[PDB]
Amino acid sequence: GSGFRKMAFPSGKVEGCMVQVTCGTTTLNGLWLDDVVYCPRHVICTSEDMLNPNYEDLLIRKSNHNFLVQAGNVQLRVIGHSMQNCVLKLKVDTANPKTPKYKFVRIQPGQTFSVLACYNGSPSGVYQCAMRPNFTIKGSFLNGSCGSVGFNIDYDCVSFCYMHHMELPTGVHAGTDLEGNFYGPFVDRQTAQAAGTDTTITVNVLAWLYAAVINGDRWFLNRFTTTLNDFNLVAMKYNYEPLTQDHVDILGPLSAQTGIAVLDMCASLKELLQNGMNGRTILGSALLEDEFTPFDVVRQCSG
Amino acid sequence: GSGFRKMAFPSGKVEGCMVQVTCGTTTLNGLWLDDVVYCPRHVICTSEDMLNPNYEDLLIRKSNHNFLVQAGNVQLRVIGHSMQNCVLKLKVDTANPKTPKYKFVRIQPGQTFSVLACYNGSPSGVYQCAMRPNFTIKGSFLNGSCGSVGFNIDYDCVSFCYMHHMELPTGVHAGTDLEGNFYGPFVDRQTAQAAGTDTTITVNVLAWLYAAVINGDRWFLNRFTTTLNDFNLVAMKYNYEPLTQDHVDILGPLSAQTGIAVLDMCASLKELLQNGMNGRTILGSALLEDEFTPFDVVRQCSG
Ligand SMILES: *[C@](=O)([C]([C][C]1[C][C][N]C1=O)[N]C(=S)[C]1[C]2[C]([C]N1C(=O)[C]([N]C(=O)C(F)(F)F)C([C])([C])[C])C2([C])[C])C1=NC2=C([C]=[C][C]=C2F)S1
Ligand SMILES: *[C@](=O)([C]([C][C]1[C][C][N]C1=O)[N]C(=S)[C]1[C]2[C]([C]N1C(=O)[C]([N]C(=O)C(F)(F)F)C([C])([C])[C])C2([C])[C])C1=NC2=C([C]=[C][C]=C2F)S1
Ligand SMILES: [Zn+2]
Ligand SMILES: [Zn+2]
């Protein structure tokens, strides 16, 4: 069949929006759209401030001219500045000529997006991620990655959904929407902070099992069926999110392509949860994958 | 630490080179660099021809004007055509204004590259791949993906190494360099064709174990050491490629960063091969990964 990979959106349209933002000695990435530059507000922090910053007091000591915005090897002139939640917005004199059509969106737990990991305003790599149920992501991010953004592409329109801010003690990642509001309960200070218990995104697992069937990987299809409540009792036990009839409906395309009822596919999933995989693999994986949505599977398997 | 993901190069520079190529009713992707368009030569085939095509006889019945090259919603004029091995080269009247600095390279088994999967000359997604020892790739590719290219980025320079041509009966993929020479023993006809036995890329597995240590995942570090020959006897048995002193030397960076000798890391790998992973995971994987090179691990873990 198609084969199967974690695929990212083409990053060109976003590459044209990345810039370097410096304030004193701190440098990080910003996003230049029309005549506004968006970056994390803790660009105005030193190493000292980050333990418990008073962002309003810190920002008061800053002027337009304390902010050094550079695009390639070319400076921009900052003519205004405002803090919106955990984001700084810098008004510059020049509209980005490379600006794409774009929206800002706040995504839901379980949805996926592409990340363009950047350093010093320069793009380094692109990868695909999911917003975990506990509003963390499992990214790859070094010092200086802050202000890197996540996004989806509709057709000609880029929907920006994420800006990178921090790594939590567990080694997973947290950040904001493009209005500066954190996903999850996190704040932008250097303090011990815990995410909750994470859960598996059941509907995504089901989508990936449909992708497996479509590619010819069918060993795990068992001989039973189940009920929503029956499945959901089992899901509880294994830390899977509960499946609803919304989820059933969203899987309708894959269900109809394959001729396999959602509840039958749920029956096969139960048995995998209770019996394990016993050394076999599925689409070359020894674990159950939950970071492809139903939409993702449809794009890559059907086109 | 960083975290760890299959990361692709940013695709923008390549997005600017993709075009649609049509001959009669067949359409596929081409690459527009300066005033040449490169595509697979079987663009000139119908469904009938593909069983056993005589490419020279087929191409003889074609003129410049039988070739419809379209970039966005804009036609180009074809003023010359030549077959180079399994590639068609079309001379057009217009130099690509978006052409990047570029080379054509023929990569070695075990090396990685990014693929920009395209349909109708339009980019759909980007993912990272390895050239298997038997010169196949495990891609994700639908009808119409042919002429999609693989590449690496040096700094400002794109090194094109792969053009997509076919899916083999096992559901893996084969194709050419940008001069039209197949990787592996494949030919461009619809016939049963077998790749050899594939093998694990041992040096890549070792690189990934170093990445694990760097991220704090250290459970598998055992208490022994080994010799190259000792390791290589064990490798033979499990279908791993033999490790050489070249490979030892290439791992020197990761070895020196971590303070763990290659041969000690080999000792840990042997035990994993003989004892298995026993339900544990490494960088969230239940299998041993062989599609990150030493260079790849250094970029993502050190930067
Ligand atoms: C960013 O680029 C980094 C990105 C971070 C570096 C390591 N992996 C990453 O994703 N973000 C940092 S330095 C943030 C900022 C302070 C502390 N912090 C952390 O990520 C921090 N995490 C926590 O304290 C947490 F609450 F437990 F999550 C550590 C311990 C992992 C360092 C902020 C304000 C939360 C940025 N770099 C700088 C920024 C501002 C000023 C100077 C920088 F160098 S933002
Ligand atoms: C391409 O876009 C496809 C890509 C292919 C479609 C399914 N997965 C893919 O990667 N390539 C095709 S149609 C090639 C071409 C003929 C047969 N073939 C195959 O990939 C073929 N494989 C074999 O016969 C093999 F030898 F076993 F590997 C199948 C059975 C998988 C179909 C070529 C010349 C080898 C292209 N599409 C067209 C092309 C040319 C003309 C018309 C097309 F529609 S190239
Ligand atoms: Zn999934
Ligand atoms: Zn590897």
Curated annotation (Swiss-Prot), chains A, B:
It catalyses: TSAVLQ-|-SGFRK-NH2 and SGVTFQ-|-GKFKK the two peptides corresponding to the two self-cleavage sites of the SARS 3C-like proteinase are the two most reactive peptide substrates. The enzyme exhibits a strong preference for substrates containing Gln at P1 position and Leu at P2 position. Inhibited by pyridone-containing alpha-ketoamides compounds 13a and 13b. In turn, alpha-ketoamide 13b (tert-butyl (1-((S)-1-(((S)-4-(benzylamino)-3,4-dioxo-1-((S)-2-oxopyrrolidin-3-yl)butan-2-yl)amino)-3-cyclopropyl-1-oxopropan-2-yl)-2-oxo-1,2-dihydropyridin-3-yl)carbamate) inhibits SARS-CoV-2 replication in human lung cells. Inhibited ex vivo by michael acceptor inhibitor N3. Inhibited ex vivo by compound 11a and 11b. Changing residue 50 to A: Does not affect ability to cleave and inactivate human TRMT1. Changing residue 146 to A: Complete loss of 3C-like proteinase nsp5 cleavage. There is a cross-link at residues 6, 91 (Glycyl lysine isopeptide (Lys-Gly) (interchain with G-Cter in ubiquitin)). Residues 2-303 form the Peptidase C30 domain. It is found in: Host cytoplasm; Host Golgi apparatus; Host nucleus. It comes from the Viruses. Residues 2-303 are cytoplasmic. The active site is at 42 (for 3cl-pro activity), 146 (nucleophile). 3CL-PRO exists as monomer and homodimer. Only the homodimer shows catalytic activity. Interacts with host FBXO22; this interaction promotes the proteasomal degradation of nsp5. Cleaves the C-terminus of replicase polyprotein at 11 sites. Recognizes substrates containing the core sequence [ILMVF]-Q-|-[SGACN]. Cleaves and inactivates human TRMT1, preventing tRNA guanine(26)-dimethylation of tRNAs. May cleave human NLRP1 in lung epithelial cells, thereby activating the NLRP1 inflammasome pathway. May cleave human GSDMD, triggering alternative GSDME-mediated epithelial cell death upon activation of the NLRP1 inflammasome, which may enhance the release interleukins 1B, 6, 16 and 18. Also able to bind an ADP-ribose-1''-phosphate (ADRP). This is 3C-like proteinase nsp5. It comes from Severe acute respiratory syndrome coronavirus 2 (2019-nCoV). The chain holds residues 3264 to 3565 of 7096 of the full protein.
